[PDB]
Curated annotation (Swiss-Prot), chains B, C, D:
Organism: Aequorea victoria
Protein name: Green fluorescent protein
Higher taxonomy: Eukaryota, Metazoa, Cnidaria, Hydrozoa, Hydroidolina
Effect of S169G: In GFPA; leads to enhanced fluorescence at 37 degrees Celsius. In Venus; leads to yellow fluorescence, improved maturation and reduced environmental sensitivity
Applications: Green fluorescent protein has been engineered to produce a vast number of variously colored mutants, fusion proteins, and biosensors. Further generation of mutants led to more stable proteins (at 37 degrees Celsius for example) with brighter fluorescence and longer fluorescence lifetimes.
Protein modification: Contains a chromophore consisting of modified amino acid residues. Maturation of the chromophore requires nothing other than molecular oxygen.
General function of this protein: Energy-transfer acceptor. Its role is to transduce the blue chemiluminescence of the protein aequorin into green fluorescent light by energy transfer. Fluoresces in vivo upon receiving energy from the Ca(2+)-activated photoprotein aequorin.
One GO biological process term: generation of precursor metabolites and energy
Resulting phenotype, V170A: In mut2.1; shifts fluorescence lifetime from 3.03 to 2.50 ns
Reported effect, V62L: In EYFP; leads to yellow fluorescence, folds faster and more efficiently at 37 degrees Celsius and has superior solubility and brightness
Keywords for this protein: Chromophore, Luminescence, Photoprotein
Name of encoding gene: GFP
C-alpha cells in the first residue's frame, strides 16, 4: 500500500452533513505528496451557504499522506490498509457546545484516493461560537496522538484543537477517533506516536461559491531511531 | 562423470515457483568451466516482474562446477553422479521471516547440463525485507560445509548466507541441503570439507526484461 | 529584496539525498555577485563517497544571483521573494533512466543566503550512465525557460540538460520546476524569458574529501 | 592507466602448470618500456627441468607494453584496464598434438606489473614435437589480430605461430584469446587492428638453472 504513495496522488472528497437540522454538502479536489507530507485541497459547499464555520470541518475533510521518517515506516497504519482502505470515525466535543459524529471510508478508487464522509452534529447553542459564526478564519498547529487497538485491529487517536475566536478567546474541541481496516489483509499496528500538523486557510479570489482552500503539512514523530 | 567437465559446458536453468501464493518463472543460460571453478549465468523472469528480490534466489539457481584440487578429487560427489545426475533439496530459513522448500534435478541432457527446479515459499511477512524488497543488489562470499550421509548414499550440507539490507542491517538465511544420486551407479562419498564461493551480480543494459547476470567462482577446500 | 544583492553575498548550501536506497549528504559554501551573475561554490560529500556522478547534482545545488539587465528588472521573480525566500521544486527525468524529485527552500538566514535541499532518486538502472558512473566531469551551457504561473503566484520553468558520456554519447535530463513564495508579500510575475547559463567544474588539489568546485555565470535574456 | 607506462616498469611473472600430468613452475623478472614497445625478461624453471620446450611457453609468459602510435592511442584496451588489470584467457591448439588451456591475471601490485598464470596441457603425443622436444631454440615474427567484443566489454584475439623443428618442418599453433577488465571502470574498445611482434631467445651463460632469456619488441598497427 506504500508503493501507491510514491508520487502525487489526486484526492476527491465528499461530505454530506446535518447540524441541528441544517443539511449541507461539500465537495473537494486536490492532491497529496506523501513524500513531503503535503496536501493541497479546495472545498466548495454545493448546497449554497455553509451553515457551520469552515475551520470546524478541517479535521473531518486523509492521514495516509503523512510523512513517515525512514525508521518509523513500520508504524504507518494508514498506508498498510491501502488500497482497500479503512473507516475512520469520530466524536468531536466542542467545549460548552454541541459535538459532531462522523463516519468516513478512505480508499483507492482507480487511481484517486477518495474520502466519502457522513456527519451529524447535535446540541449546538443557537448563540454559541459555532452556530453564531464567531470563529476566525485561520488554523493553529496540533499534534495527533496515536496508539494501537489490537482488539479491533486498528488504532485509536485523541487530540484537541484550539480555534481562535473573534473576541479574543479560544474554542477547544476534543477529538476521539478510531480507524479500522476494510480489507481482510494484515495491517501494521503502531507503537505509540504522534503526528505534527500545520495548516493554512485561504480563499480563491475568482471563486463565487462558498469554499475554503487548504495547505497542510503532516509529519510523523515520537519514536526513537 | 569427471571426463564431462574437461572443457566449457553450457548450462540450462528452469525454476517454477510460488511465494505466498505468488507464482512466477525464471529461465537461465550460460556455461561453466570446472577447470577454474567458474560460472557465467544470465536469468530472466518469464512471468513479468519477479515478486522476490533476485539475491534470494542465487543459491537455488549447479555445484558440480566447483574446482577440486588435485589431492581432493576423490571427494567430488557432484561429478561422480554424472551424467545421470542427482536430486538437490533445501529448506532455507530466513531469520524472522518465511522460508523456501526447493527440489531440483541436475543432470546431463545431451551435452547441456540442466538444472530443473521447483520452489515453494511460505510464511513471508508482508513488510519484511524480502516481500518488502529491502535487500540490496549484491552478494557476499560464503563457505558451504559438506559431509557424507552414508545411509541415503549422498551428502548433507549446511551453510548460512548474509544479505545486505539498504538500511544497513543484514538478513541471514540458514540453508539445509541434501543431495542423492539418480543413477544406480556407485558415487564418491566425501570426507568432511567445504566450498569457498564468490559471486558478483550485475545487469545487462540492453535488457528490458526482469533479469540478473551472475559471475561465480567455487573452489573446494578443507582436506589435508 | 534587490537591495540585498548589491554586493557579494555568502551562500550556504545543504542537501540530504537518497538514490535507489543510497543515502548521502553534501555541504557547500561560496559567494555570489548578482551584479555580474557570478557564482563560486565548493561542495563536499560529508557521508564519504557520493553514490551518483557530481554533474547530475549541479542544477539542484540558487538562481536569485542571475544578472538581470536594466530594462528587464521588473521581471526578476527570485529577488522579489527575498528575504523571506521561495520554495523550488523539481522532477528531473533522465532519458532511459530514473528521475529526481527535489524540494528546496532558498532564503536569507541573517546575511547568508541558504539553500536547504531534499532529494529522492527512484528507478535508476544498475548499469546505466548514472549509477554506473559513465558521465564525464564537465558541463555544457544551457538556457532555462521561464513563465509566470499567476495561479500559484510563482513561475514555472522547464529546460533540458545534455551530459557528455565517456563512450561519446550524451545523457539528457528534462527539468520541470516550480517556484513559489514563502512570504505573503507581492512578488514580480514575469513575462516569458530565459536565463543563459555557463558553468565550469573542477577539483581542489589539496582536498582529500569527495567534492566539486563550481564556477558559474547566469544572465537573464529574451525580453525586448 | 597510460600515465603508468611512461618509464621503465619492473615486471614479475609466475606460472604454475601441468602438461599431461607433468607439473612444473616458472618465475620471471624483467622490465618493459612501453615507449619503445620494448621487453627484457629472464625466466627460470623452479621445479627443475621444464617438461615442455621453452618456445611453447613464449606467448603465455604482457601486451600492455606494446607501442601504440599517437593516432592509435584511443585503441589501447590493455593500458586502459590498468591498474586494476585484465583477465587473459587462451586455448592454444598445436596442429596434430595437444593444446594449452591458460588463465591469467595481469595487473599492478604496487609499482610492479605482475602476470600470474595457470596452465593445463592435455592430449600431447608422447612422440610428438612437443613432449619429444624437437622444437629448435628460436622464435619467428608474428601479427596478433585484435577486435572488440562489446559483449564481454573486452577484446578477442586470434593468431597463429610457426615453430621451427630440428628436422626441417614447422609446428603450427592456433591461438584463441579473450581479455576482460577486472575493474568496473570503462575501458577503451578498439577498432580492428593488429600487433607486430619480434622476439629473440637466448641463454645466460652463468646460469645453471633451466631458464630462458627473452628480448621482444611489440608495435601496434593496422589503423589509418
Amino acid at each position: 500500500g506504500e508503493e501507491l504513495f510514491t508520487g502525487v496522488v489526486p484526492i476527491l472528497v465528499e461530505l454530506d452533513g446535518d447540524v441541528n437540522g441544517h443539511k449541507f454538502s461539500v465537495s473537494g479536489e486536490g492532491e497529496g505528496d506523501a513524500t513531503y507530507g503535503k496536501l493541497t485541497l479546495k472545498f466548495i459547499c454545493t448546497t449554497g451557504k455553509l451553515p457551520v464555520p469552515w475551520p470546524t470541518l478541517v479535521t473531518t475533510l486523509v492521514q495516509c499522506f503523512s510523512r513517515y521518517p525512514d525508521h518509523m515506516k513500520r508504524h504507518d497504519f494508514f498506508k498498510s490498509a491501502m488500497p482497500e482502505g479503512y473507516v475512520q470515525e469520530r466524536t468531536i466535543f466542542f467545549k460548552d457546545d454541541g459535538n459532531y459524529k462522523t463516519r468516513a471510508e478512505v480508499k483507492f478508487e482507480g487511481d484517486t484516493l477518495v474520502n466519502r464522509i457522513e456527519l451529524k452534529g447535535i446540541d449546538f447553542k443557537e448563540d454559541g461560537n459555532i452556530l453564531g459564526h464567531k470563529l476566525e478564519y485561520n488554523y493553529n498547529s496540533h499534534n495527533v496522538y496515536i496508539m494501537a487497538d489490537k482488539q479491533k485491529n486498528g488504532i485509536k487517536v485523541n487530540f484537541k484543537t484550539r480555534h481562535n475566536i473573534e473576541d479574543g478567546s479560544v474554542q477547544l474541541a476534543d477529538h476521539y477517533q478510531q480507524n479500522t481496516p476494510i480489507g481482510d489483509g494484515p495491517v501494521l499496528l503502531p507503537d505509540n506516536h504522534y503526528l505534527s500538523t500545520q495548516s493554512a486557510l485561504s480563499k480563491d479570489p475568482n471563486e463565487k461559491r462558498d469554499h475554503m482552500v487548504l495547505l497542510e503539512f503532516v509529519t510523523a514523530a515520537g519514536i526513537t531511531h
